[PDB]
Design a protein around this ligand. Structure first.
Ligand code: CA
Length: 224
DNA sequence: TGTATCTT
DNA sequence: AAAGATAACA
């Protein structure tokens, strides 16, 4: 096998792979790759499944869709692998972390794997993008798939913190039982929207408050 | 030059 | 659906 989709996630989501919408979606993505550059590369569409067991997810960060520039997106929302510098969205995330978490210091890179390993699911609502065109693969099938991810977690986990960043991610909110999980919503951290509430949202400290109240270990946001 | 959300 | 307006900053 290719080992692209983590095993505990495949166990609970592989049913989607036999559904017409998903078969047609992956066909659409393959047709796009034939004529255009699509991000992330094929082996990294599902990196978000490879960092921790699905049963160990404690926090879900949901963005819009992947970065659309060369060598940026690698399947963890808002993350970029070294040596690529943090894009403007991630610099804004770091800026809010710096005011929200007193101990947080800019790490010098943009790889968020260290949050994902602690059980922060770094998901985007749409999981591919045509180069240079933000949200170009919306409404093609990804939303049903990431709905299935959110629905599984909603039903099988307890006390999750969902952070829905941007209008497209917030479409998932209706699916989440608010008396069982915690949903925090704010604007996307892109410079094009950050001033609509992201700065000052304090989601990182709020997340840890909620985890600690429910007996769970907080996220160490400096562990990158 | 580039990186959302609203209105028509 | 999508063009354009609105939006803040480098
Ligand atoms: Ca991304």
């Amino acid at each position: 096998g290719s080992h692209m989709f983590g095993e505990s996630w495949k166990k609970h989501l592989s049913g989607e792979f036999g559904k017409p919408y998903f078969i047609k979606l992956m066909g659409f993505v393959a047709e796009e790759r034939k004529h255009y550059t699509v991000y992330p590369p094929p082996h990294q569409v599902f990196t978000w499944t490879q960092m921790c067991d699905i049963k160990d997810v404690k926090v879900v960060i949901l963005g819009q869709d992947p970065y659309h520039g060369p060598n940026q997106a690698h399947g963890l929302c808002f993350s970029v692998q070294r040596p690529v510098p943090p894009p403007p969205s991630l610099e804004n995330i770091y800026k809010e972390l710096s005011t929200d978490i007193e101990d947080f210091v800019h790490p010098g890179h943009g790889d968020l794997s260290g949050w994902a390993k602690q059980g922060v699911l770094l998901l985007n609502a749409v999981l591919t993008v045509r180069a240079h065109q933000a949200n170009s693969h919306k409404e093609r099938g990804w939303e049903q798939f990431t709905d299935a991810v959110v629905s599984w977690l909603n039903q099988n986990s307890n006390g999750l913190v969902f952070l829905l960043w941007g209008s497209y991610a917030q479409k998932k909110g209706s699916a989440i039982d608010r008396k069982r999980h915690h949903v925090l919503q704010t604007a996307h951290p892109s410079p094009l929207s950050v001033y609509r509430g992201f700065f000052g949202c304090r989601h990182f400290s709020k997340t840890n408050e909620l985890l600690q109240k429910s007996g769970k270990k907080p996220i160490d946001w400096k562990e990158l």
